[PDB]
Ligand SMILES: CCCCCCCC/C=C/CCCCCCCC(=O)O[C@@H](COC(=O)CCCCCCCCCCCCCCC)COP(=O)([O-])OCC[N+](C)(C)C
Ligand SMILES: CCCCCCCC/C=C/CCCCCCCC(=O)O[C@@H](COC(=O)CCCCCCCCCCCCCCC)COP(=O)([O-])OCC[N+](C)(C)C
Ligand SMILES: CCCCCCCC/C=C/CCCCCCCC(=O)O[C@@H](COC(=O)CCCCCCCCCCCCCCC)COP(=O)([O-])OCC[N+](C)(C)C
Ligand SMILES: CCCCCCCC/C=C/CCCCCCCC(=O)O[C@@H](COC(=O)CCCCCCCCCCCCCCC)COP(=O)([O-])OCC[N+](C)(C)C
């Protein structure tokens with residue numbers, strides 16, 4: 001469940017913030033939001049940052065149409081496959 | 093789980109945005125929010141768009157009182173029937 005988190009957090013922080021000098025924030029923001037997604041916080045007004053309902057209208061740029069797909073793939077793994085593999089673990 | 097998504101996404105985008113010329117946005121918005129609902133994002137201030145607490149006070153029009161019902165029916169299927177059919181699948 002932590003590979004999948006960084007499988008998703010590294011492409012997204014790369015696709016959305018493509019001017020980042022080296023920083024320690026690149027160690028939180030590849031791990032931060034993808035962890036709070038496991039608990040149902042979808043950051044729905046930060047998907048599709050080019051949309052009109054966005055809290056992030058400044059992050060709109062080339063390639064930022066890819067993150068809705070990556071996240072679709074992400075939660076299907078982190079909320080349906082894997083977090084319900086735990087449930088089946090404990091129950092058995 | 094993808095019929096139910098479009099069983100719901102097509103009536104809602106038809107009932108709420110009834111002036112839409114042909115567009116590629118009609119291929120996202122019939123699939124977008126009904127997918128993030130499966131993960132607990134209810135878009136609670138976008139149900140009942142005619143209400144006073146709405147983020148969508150401009151979408152108020154004829155027929156838009158139907159979407160709270162469709163969505164009630166939707167999540168009962170996509171969060172109680174079907175997403176707990178997975179759980180029972182994996183556990184067994
Ligand atoms: C043994 C079992 C292992 C356990 C797990 C591994 C250990 C956990 C590892 C975590 C990675 C390390 C994170 C800290 C990195 C330094 C951050 C920093 O310096 O600045 C940050 C500040 O913000 C913070 O310091 C907040 C604390 C970090 C968030 C922790 C997330 C935990 C949830 C996820 C955990 C799941 C991990 C999933 C696996 C990958 C950001 O930079 P800044 O610019 O200073 O901030 C902006 C400030 N400003 C606006 C005023 C300008
Ligand atoms: C399923 C039933 C539902 C309907 C289906 C219908 C299918 C028909 C689909 C048709 C897609 C092609 C038409 C869109 C292109 C028009 C141009 C455009 O808007 O470009 C946008 C890019 O947006 C994209 O490129 C959109 C994503 C394209 C791929 C679609 C998924 C592949 C099919 C599924 C397979 C997936 C694999 C699954 C893996 C498991 C750019 O515009 P913007 O976003 O505003 O950003 C630019 C902003 N800026 C200029 C300031 C920087
Ligand atoms: C093998 C397994 C199959 C997997 C599933 C099938 C594949 C997935 C199918 C996907 C349908 C195709 C979607 C893209 C269509 C083109 C969008 C476009 O061009 O414009 C859109 C841009 O926004 C985007 O491009 C965002 C990318 C799509 C979001 C996908 C959501 C995933 C969740 C659902 C996944 C579950 C699917 C459930 C089944 C139905 C919007 O229009 P615009 O005007 O260009 O943008 C506004 C910008 N402006 C405000 C600045 C003006
Ligand atoms: C359950 C226990 C709780 C209580 C029960 C009590 C029951 C009593 C029921 C009473 C219903 C009638 C009262 C309202 C009619 C007055 C007109 C009105 O307000 O219209 C509004 C529409 O809103 C409606 O039409 C409301 C929904 C009507 C159907 C009721 C549900 C069916 C019963 C249940 C079975 C379901 C089947 C289940 C399937 C599985 C219009 O006003 P607006 O919304 O502002 O939109 C207009 C905006 N505009 C003017 C700008 C365009």
Ligand SMILES: CCCCCCCC/C=C\CCCCCCCC(=O)O[C@@H](COC(=O)CCCCCCCCCCCCCCC)COP(=O)([O-])OCC[N+](C)(C)C
Nearest residue numbers: 011015050059060061062063064065066067069070073116
């Ligand atoms: C049956 C299933 C079929 C679906 C399969 C996928 C088929 C579709 C594949 C690819 C779709 C590519 C076209 C969509 C983007 C168009 C808009 C655009 O360029 O937006 C932005 C940049 O966008 C880029 O720079 C994207 C560059 C090409 C794709 C990058 C790699 C992703 C694909 C890797 C492969 C993934 C394969 C995944 C396989 C699972 C900005 O817009 P612009 O236009 O650049 O400039 C401004 C606007 N203007 C110039 C108009 C004024």
Ligand SMILES: CCCCCCCC/C=C\CCCCCCCC(=O)O[C@@H](COC(=O)CCCCCCCCCCCCCCC)COP(=O)([O-])OCC[N+](C)(C)C
Nearest residue numbers: 103107110142151152153154155156157158159161162165
């Ligand atoms: C025991 C079970 C009982 C329940 C069963 C259902 C029974 C109840 C059935 C139907 C309720 C219809 C009345 C409610 C709407 C009134 C308000 C209204 O018109 O709002 C808006 C438009 O609304 C429309 O234009 C709706 C037109 C009629 C219904 C459309 C088909 C939906 C029902 C299909 C069948 C579904 C069957 C489902 C069965 C599972 C706007 O208001 P207006 O007034 O038009 O204009 C403005 C306001 N003014 C003029 C006042 C200034």
Ligand SMILES: C[C@@H]1CC[C@@]2(OC1)O[C@H]1C[C@H]3[C@@H]4CC=C5C[C@@H](OCCC(CO)CO)CC[C@]5(C)[C@H]4CC[C@]3(C)[C@H]1[C@@H]2C
Nearest residue numbers: 003006007009010021022023024025026027028029030031
């Ligand atoms: C198997 C896993 C693959 C992924 C991964 O774990 C192992 O690989 C690790 C490598 C790490 C980076 C290494 C070095 C630096 C340089 C530093 O520079 C401070 C400069 C300045 C600040 O202002 C000083 O003043 C910033 C942090 C950064 C980029 C690391 C980020 C986290 C990364 C990407 C880790 C990531 C989680």
Ligand SMILES: C[C@@H]1CC[C@@]2(OC1)O[C@H]1C[C@H]3[C@@H]4CC=C5C[C@@H](OCCC(CO)CO)CC[C@]5(C)[C@H]4CC[C@]3(C)[C@H]1[C@@H]2C
Nearest residue numbers: 095098099101102113114115116117118119120121122123
């Ligand atoms: C079994 C399932 C039943 C439902 C469904 O899947 C199969 O049936 C599909 C038919 C699709 C539409 C067909 C043609 C177009 C025309 C295009 O026109 C671009 C015009 C302009 C843009 O500005 C060019 O410049 C816009 C998209 C649209 C309306 C499709 C949307 C998605 C739809 C509704 C699909 C939907 C998910």
Ligand SMILES: [Ca+2]
Nearest residue numbers: 039040131132
């Ligand atoms: Ca939740």
